[PDB]
Design a protein around this ligand. Structure first.
Ligand SMILES: Cc1ccc(NS(=O)(=O)c2cccc(C#N)c2)c2[nH]cc(C#N)c12
Ligand SMILES: [Zn+2]
Lengths: 783, 183, 56, 82, 208
């Protein structure tokens, strides 16, 4: 049996959402930030953002909206988790005492219904009559907002439009009305429906359905006096309101997709628009006052303000200050000013907040390949101390070469196909600013192998791969009886005509005297997804085949053996003669290289359906897996008939709540992992007795520590997929047990009350608060 | 408790007839002292006569019914409710505006599996079958059942699909793992 | 320019320039959120036939 | 005599079992083959129904051709048989 | 959209689901001829497809005055040969004098059992009888996924009740012949709704 302990080294740093409003007091202007499971509460003060409290929710925050139903002196918070836990939260302060009250809570999941392509959408009616939720295709969930009833009986309304892109509740409506963009075989359309709480149905919307741009991706509900809706596309911006229909096709917006918006003015006169390239625009709604008192929208105008980090969300704060919530790069506080600078920009950065996400690869003290596109960087983490190395392009893979005192970094940069012959770069980056550079022999991605100095992180050399060649995998090792250490790169030919790679290369490089020399090339008939040093041989995975290569005295790669039983062999990890193969669609499998046989042997496979993200070998008998549903699992050789030995058993299950892209090596062992949200964690093994004590301690802590939104810890950490839900097993939440040191002394005594149990290799203890304090403190020293 | 419902329970270890066996051929041990077989029946004939008697406004003009066609419109596993549509060929006198005529109607009935108790949810209007054949009426009826299920069709998750396999096929696909067996 | 006159909630906010919440044993709730158990097709037919019953 | 019919202009979610239910009341059916896309993993919108009797297949066409099944007007016709 | 462009999106988004790889071609294509055991060439199996988990691939036999039906479970491993796991005799002690249109179904969440619905175009008696049709339905237990403690207890080459039982039933339907509705009939896990044209029967088989 396998017992594991998972703890957070670095909490998530990517910003998934941000809202402004009056949550703490009616007077306080608050900033609320969602960093996966984490909710950060701030007060906008003279000095900037004064932190109030950071609360960890037992769920991935999917909906975070402030609303004020009548009778409330302050805004209430609505939260929906990825596991469909819904809650209405109230902030309460009594002198120095701070409490987050759960006004209402419950799970709003449906057994029927398939999660929608554009994900969970949560909207609140301007007149706080109801909460609207788009969770599944074909259904619209409505939570009636009634305060004089024991339960908020939520119901589903059928939606004929099975593919909705975005939806919002409209302003200035006598009847609650939703406005949404949907897709069907005739294209994209904008439609409205009135919501009847009495009849539990939709009624004909205020204005006729209108046909829209093929890539119309977001709806903006414009407040009164304008009313109506703004629909943002790839090439156009339109306004719709019953009679009115305005359309602007500004060429400025054509190059990049607008992905976020934020209302500047309470009346919706100005909106901030953020695109994929990090550009910031101002959408202007020019008004016309009517003599009947009403105000009509006369024209729309967009103007480029400047550049910010690639924004996931934007929130205007106060006095021209805007918070840029970034997912792919560092978050910012930016200042808006009417006078342009040296480059003509109206945006000036005030503060920068480090974001490690997405950690797409890492090295070991810790060196990550962080961010993407212009936000691409390297991050050096030690005792936490963080150093950032800007690349201004996408880092893909990293490897350390001790003998060369340098790192090997695969990277990609975007170039544009122009009026002229070839393609040209849009921005200067690491691959175009190296000390020396080379090119291979025998919008688009240009792939490079970067040689970066281990001390200064200076880009010493940049080797550009062939036209349409993508570098996928990277290793630094010595092969065969050859004493030299090489940078080995696995590639694929990505053409603008085909879908699957049918060609690729394995290229052996040697770095000397500030330059990279091509030692050898080996043609493959597919994509070289992963490569690992394996007992002085090269283990590589080409499409669906795992292959072992020998390095000859002739400095050539000679294929030795192949294993063909894979769908997409994306991940490889080895320990001795054992190979752990991770499939994008077919779970994991264990192979063994048979030295006296010169071939592989399929030892055992995990027969469970799992879409893998990363794999790791804990020990000779325990294998760690991370999948697409944000769960961790541990496989073990079934401990007998040959068929029984050929079956890997999932003995450990745990809902992590993060997407793992890289695993790398009291408690035994230390496997560090990097995630999409920039969270860094540690997985370690426990003895049976250590696990038993820590598990009893978890159950005791859960009876004392309360959850915001009243989400059960056990429910949160339960292994969950669209196929099954099972309670977490063989896994200890290190974060929960560590929190014992942070609870008051009277609460510690109630946790350790009539606890002895502890079978430390034999017999029973008699546990006090001080016994466990010593236990938890030794555990905090693992990271 | 009701007369329209019939429930039978039988236990095993080594109305419809059951030839419960192992993988070889042994008919196991039929007793009530392990395997558990359950059989909850719903008599259409009773339901039809009950719904016409109490829930059809035209119930006074009804004479007798001929054939009937039962098409399931919905199965709710969370509430254990089966929504069945009952296609019906009957004989009835018309409105005072006699002479007995053949008509066709639809009876929507919700059937609870926990209680075994049915509930009537819709009584159709008596529509005349003027010189339409028996096949003409059942084809049009089923077409309306198809029409309704398609209208109310809400996509289900990946993991809750009822797999259906039959070969009289060019490829055998494993959708979730993008694997095909070419025949 | 149309960047002049940005919203001012308070001038005393940017002209100048977080603690973890561990909820202690304290639990006063108010309401619960529940989903309508009955099927949407059934609810609609129930709704339409009950309106036909009202048709006096 | 034995007659084969062409059924077309069908909604892609119309199943073989649905087609059987709609056509079976007219007479005995020897075979039904709804054409499927190997690459989509969904109906092509057309197929063939083979009645045991020619007069039974004639009445199925007379009563179903040009009439809407799930909003799409069904196209029921004859076939080569040569 | 190139598979590698799709895969890069995954690494920076953390959004990997099959309903995204929906439009791309199959990753692996293997011909039935290259994975089928040569001794089963003379047998003439009719391959039905994959079980919900990609582990098994099922097939049937319509062997012969009466017809005998058999259900097979083959272990699938992409290019490797199919390995026969389970062979069961469908519709026990039942003499079928006409070739059945059989369908093998699987419940939404219950992977323990499968249902085999076989029906003939029209019932008989020697002579074809136009007013009736025969429905044959069998509930078969699937092989154990791993090591089974109850299965280990055996006296001959076998399988416990949970991972080795079978259920059979036969019923006559009349005009209009009831519609086959497999998705609704098995919407509730472990229940089969069977329209016998005179009543709807709810059939629950469960091992404890
Ligand atoms: C009216 C009707 C409904 C449903 C089915 N079959 S099903 O239960 O397998 C099903 C359920 C829902 C959607 C689909 C799909 N695509 C299939 C029918 N078979 C014959 C019918 C007739 N007349 C019929
Ligand atoms: Zn068993």
């Amino acid at each position: 049996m396998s017992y594991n302990y998972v703890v957070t080294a670095q909490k998530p740093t990517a910003v998934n959402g941000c809202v402004t409003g009056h949550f703490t007091s009616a007077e306080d202007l608050n900033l609320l930030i969602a960093k996966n499971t984490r909710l950060e509460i701030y007060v906008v003060t003279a000095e900037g953002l004064r932190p109030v409290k950071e609360v960890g929710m037992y769920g991935k925050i999917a909906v975070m909206e402030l609303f004020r139903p009548k009778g409330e002196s302050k805004d209430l918070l609505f939260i929906l988790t990825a596991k469909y836990n819904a809650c209405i939260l109230e902030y309460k302060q009594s002198g120095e005492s701070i409490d987050i009250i759960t006004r209402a809570h419950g799970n709003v999941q449906d057994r029927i219904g398939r999660p929608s392509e554009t994900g969970i959408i949560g909207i609140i009616d301007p007149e706080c009559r109801m909460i609207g939720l788009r969770l599944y295709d074909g259904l619209f969930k409505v939570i009636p907002l009634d305060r004089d009833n024991k339960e908020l009986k939520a119901f589903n309304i059928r939606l004929e439009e099975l593919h909705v892109i975005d939806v919002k509740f409209l302003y200035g409506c006598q009847a609650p009305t939703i406005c949404f963009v949907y897709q069907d075989p005739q294209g994209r359309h904008v439609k409205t429906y009135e919501v009847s709480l009495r009849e539990k149905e939709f009624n004909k919307g205020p204005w006729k359905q209108e046909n829209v741009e093929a890539e119309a991706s977001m709806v903006i509900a414009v407040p009164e006096p304008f009313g109506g809706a703004i629909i943002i596309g790839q090439e156009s911006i339109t306004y719709h309101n019953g009679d009115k229909y305005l359309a602007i096709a500004p060429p400025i917006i054509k190059q990049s997709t607008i992905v976020c918006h934020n209302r500047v003015d309470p009346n919706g006169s100005r909106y901030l628009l953020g695109d994929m390239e990090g550009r910031l625009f101002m959408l202007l709604l020019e008004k016309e006052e009517q003599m009947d008192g009403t105000v009509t929208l006369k024209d729309l105008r967009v103007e480029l303000l400047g550049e910010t980090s690639i924004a996931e969300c934007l929130t205007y704060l106060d006095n021209g200050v805007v918070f840029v919530g970034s997912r792919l790069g560092d978050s910012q506080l930016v200042k808006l000013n009417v006078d342009s600078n040296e480059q003509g920009s109206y945006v000036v950065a005030m503060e920068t907040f480090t974001n490690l996400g997405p950690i797409v690869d890492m090295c070991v003290q810790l060196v990550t390949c962080s961010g993407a596109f212009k936000e691409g960087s390297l991050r050096i983490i030690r005792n936490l101390h963080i150093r950032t190395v800007p690349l201004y392009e996408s880092p893909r893979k990293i490897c350390y070469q001790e003998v060369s005192q340098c790192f090997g970094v695969l990277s990609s940069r975007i170039e544009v196909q122009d009026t002229s012959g070839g393609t040209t770069a849009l921005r200067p980056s690491a691959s175009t600013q190296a000390l020396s550079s080379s090119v291979s022999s025998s919008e688009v991605e240009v792939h490079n192998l970067l040689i970066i100095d281990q001390h200064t992180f200076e880009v010493l050399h940049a080797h550009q791969f062939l036209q349409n060649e993508y570098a996928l995998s990277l290793v630094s090792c010595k092969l065969g009886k050859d004493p030299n250490t090489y940078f080995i790169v696995g590639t694929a030919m990505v053409y603008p005509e085909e879908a699957e790679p049918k060609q690729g290369r394995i290229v052996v490089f040697q770095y000397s005297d500030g330059k990279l020399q091509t030692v050898a090339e080996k043609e493959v008939k597919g994509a070289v997804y992963s490569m690992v040093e394996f007992n002085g041989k090269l283990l590589a995975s080409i499409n669906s085949t795992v292959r072992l290569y020998e390095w000859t005295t002739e400095k050539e790669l000679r294929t030795e053996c192949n294993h063909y039983n894979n769908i997409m062999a994306l991940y490889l990890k080895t320990k001795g003669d054992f190979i752990l193969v991770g499939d994008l669609m077919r779970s994991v499998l264990l192979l063994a290289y048979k030295p006296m046989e010169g071939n592989f042997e399929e030892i055992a496979r995990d027969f469970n359906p799992n879409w893998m993200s990363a794999v790791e070998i804990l020990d000779d008998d325990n294998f760690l897996g991370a999948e697409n549903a944000f769960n961790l699992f541990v496989c073990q050789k079934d401990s007998t008939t040959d068929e029984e030995r050929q079956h890997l058993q999932e003995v450990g299950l745990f809902h992590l709540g993060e997407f793992v892209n890289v695993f790398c090596h009291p408690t035994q062992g230390s496997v560090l992992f990097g995630t999409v949200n920039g969270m860094i964690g540690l997985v370690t093994s426990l003895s049976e007795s250590w696990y038993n004590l820590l598990l009893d301690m978890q159950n005791r802590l859960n009876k004392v520590i309360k959850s915001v939104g009243k989400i059960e810890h056990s429910f949160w950490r339960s292994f969950h997929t669209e196929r099954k839900t099972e309670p977490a097993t063989g896994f200890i939440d290190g974060d929960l047990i560590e929190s014992f040191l942070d609870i008051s002394r009277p609460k510690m005594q109630e946790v350790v009350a009539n606890l002895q149990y502890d079978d430390g290799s034999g017999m029973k203890r008699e546990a006090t608060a001080d016994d466990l304090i010593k236990v938890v403190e030794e555990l905090t020293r693992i990271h | 408790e009701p007369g329209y419902v019939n429930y039978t329970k039988l236990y095993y270890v080594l109305s419809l007839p059951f030839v419960v066996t192992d993988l070889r051929g042994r008919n196991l041990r039929p007793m009530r002292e392990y395997l558990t077989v359950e059989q909850l029946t719903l008599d259409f004939e009773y339901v039809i006569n009950e719904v016409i008697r109490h829930d059809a406004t035209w119930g006074h003009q009804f004479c007798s019914f001929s054939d009937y066609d039962i098409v399931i419109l919905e199965v709710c596993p969370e509430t254990n409710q089966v929504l069945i549509n009952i296609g019906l060929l009957l004989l009835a006198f018309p409105s005072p505006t006699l002479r007995p005529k053949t008509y066709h109607t639809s009876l929507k009935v919700a059937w609870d599996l926990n209680t075994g108790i049915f509930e009537t949810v819709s009584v159709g209007d008596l529509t005349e079958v003027k010189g339409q054949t028996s096949g003409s009426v059942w084809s049009s009826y089923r077409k309306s059942c198809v029409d309704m299920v398609m209208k109310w069709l809400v996509p289900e998750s990946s993991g809750r699909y009822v797999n259906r396999m039959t070969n009289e096929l060019k490829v055998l696909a494993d959708s979730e793992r993008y694997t095909w067996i070419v025949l | 320019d149309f960047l002049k006159g940005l919203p001012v909630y308070n001038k005393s906010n940017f002209s100048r320039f977080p603690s973890v919440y561990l909820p202690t044993r304290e639990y006063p709730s108010e309401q619960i959120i529940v989903t309508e158990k009955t099927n949407i097709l059934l609810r609609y037919l129930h709704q339409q036939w009950d309106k036909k019953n009202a048709a006096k | 005599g034995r007659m084969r019919l062409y059924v077309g202009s069908l909604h892609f979610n119309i199943t073989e079992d649905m087609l059987r239910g709609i056509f079976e009341p007219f007479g005995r059916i020897e075979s039904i083959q709804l054409m499927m896309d190997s690459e989509t993993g969904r109906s092509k919108g057309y197929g063939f129904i083979t009645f045991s009797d020619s007069e039974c297949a004639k009445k199925a066409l007379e009563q179903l051709n040009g009439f809407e099944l799930a909003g799409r007007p069904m196209k029921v016709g004859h076939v080569t048989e040569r | 959209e190139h598979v590698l462009k799709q895969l890069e999106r995954v690494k920076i988004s953390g959004q990997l689901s099959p309903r995204l790889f929906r439009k791309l071609p199959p990753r692996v294509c293997v011909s039935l001829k290259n994975i089928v055991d040569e001794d089963f060439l003379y047998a003439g199996h009719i391959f039905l497809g994959f079980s919900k988990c990609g582990r098994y691939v099922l097939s049937y036999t319509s062997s012969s005055s009466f017809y005998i039906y058999h259900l097979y479970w083959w272990e699938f491993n992409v290019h490797s040969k199919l390995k026969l796991v389970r062979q069961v005799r469908l519709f026990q002690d039942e003499e079928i004098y006409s070739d059945l249109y059989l369908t093998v179904c699987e419940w939404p969440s219950d992977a323990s059992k499968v249902i085999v619905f076989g029906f003939n175009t029209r019932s008989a008696n020697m002579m074809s009888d136009e007013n009736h049709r025969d429905i044959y339905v069998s509930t078969v237990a699937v092989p154990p996924p791993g090591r089974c403690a109850a299965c280990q207890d055996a006296s001959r080459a076998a399988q416990c009740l949970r991972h080795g039982f079978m259920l059979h039933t036969k019923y006559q339907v009349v005009y209009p012949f009831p519609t086959f509705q497999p998705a609704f009939q098995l919407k509730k896990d472990q229940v089969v709704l069977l329209n016998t044209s005179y009543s709807l029967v709810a059939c629950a088989v469960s091992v404890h």
